[PDB]
Amino acid sequence: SEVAHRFKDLGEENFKALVLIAFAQYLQQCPFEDHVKLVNEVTEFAKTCVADESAENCDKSLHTLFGDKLCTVATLRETYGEMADCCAKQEPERNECFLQHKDDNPNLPRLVRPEVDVMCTAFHDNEETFLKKYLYEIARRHPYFYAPELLFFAKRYKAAFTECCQAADKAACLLPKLDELRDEGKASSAKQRLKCASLQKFGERAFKAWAVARLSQRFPKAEFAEVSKLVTDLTKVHTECCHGDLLECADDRADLAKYICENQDSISSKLKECCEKPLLEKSHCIAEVENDEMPADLPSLAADFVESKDVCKNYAEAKDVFLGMFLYEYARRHPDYSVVLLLRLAKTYETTLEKCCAAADPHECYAKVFDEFKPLVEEPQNLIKQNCELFEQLGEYKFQNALLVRYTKKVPQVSTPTLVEVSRNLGKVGSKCCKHPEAKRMPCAEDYLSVVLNQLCVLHEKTPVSDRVTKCCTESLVNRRPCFSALEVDETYVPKEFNAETFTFHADICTLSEKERQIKKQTALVELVKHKPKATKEQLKAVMDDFAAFVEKCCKADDKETCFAEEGKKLVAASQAA
Which CATH number is 379-490 given? Predict the structure, then answer.
């Protein structure tokens, strides 16, 4: 009995949670109630098998059990049309059908948040339904959210209410803490969305490489043999979690933390504080620990990777282990390098050994490899420096508007919502990284760009409209950024024609706060740069300037929010002039 196996390990609590998340991520459009029902039944069933591990179907694979359960509501195509099909499928892959129908953009209405006076009450009355609702809403909106981490976010979410609810001014103690969690959650979510795409779209060898570089950077003292151990395990965990095997992923994840904490002195010295606390907190700690650490007297890379005469031979023996060793040896001494740069260097080295090794004299051919690294290392550096300077001259909002015009010109076909979203997140890097010393700037900036670009890629994978995006997305994982950086205004794009239905103006804009106000402006800039790509000096501003005027006036003009309609058509006349 598998289910009875996972139960004992995680326990009734975490098993119940890990199963709701799994259900929520599969049937995102399914109501809370129904999910809770199936979860309970699935939990009840579990508790019998614990005792008698051979009764009903306790001799089953979680997938068939989970699958059939969901299929008790999925067959309702009038609600979940294309789902019924997956149900009519079999075992080798009824699940595979589920995964390919996971949506990255829940057509689920915005999630509003009740006055501090209600959440507190509802929290106190029923603390269980209250937290269950929280996992259901997140997991159904983030189908790839790293499950084991969602549990950690829950414990925190609970403590945010458990405390603030008993404060003099709950709204003051809560709101902040809640806003802080809303952000950190979107990050963790994007980070893992990238990890799932590497295993799935680029294979495990790709993920393995990413892990070797990242871990080696973090634990420079660790031996290659150790790192590989960690890499193999960590890959398994994430392979499970990305496939939908949340229970085993959670279990395995816990086993890794246990190990890492045990062998400690072998791996890192900064683990001292992560190993002294709750499991959940221990896991989230290790995963975010600062690099250790780097060893004092370290030999030069040139020694065994370009000067030795055995290179080609060792590369032939075990190429993968050799390249793995190179990456680990280059990463440990370079925490100032972004992970994708280290992978770029590694890919360049491999490509070199492949052409050089089949030569009359390789040591002659591959002897100047490090000469090819220079450009690769400096490009990113120059890009960061020149984009951070601009950022701290325009601030975040102005900077975002910059990237918005920049990128809409690059790939006009892309839907406005995505561009606005992507550009916004891109701009947030400035605030996030630019304030860092060079030593930490690139790792910060470049890697975060990877996550952000991945979004665009996955969101675009939904409805392909620009082959240039497809090309840069699909081509290579490590060169996505450089690929996009090279892109320039699309000379084949044919400008849109403006129609009233394009941009609609209703007074309803005057009620939203600052954020949604900017986002409505930015969404305008994009629709603008789509109808007048070329002809645009900086005249765009002139128009964007006029747009603001429109909202202010019409929002504070005491006429029925009518001027909006009249002045709405008025600004259009002006906009075209420019």
Answer: 1.10.246.10
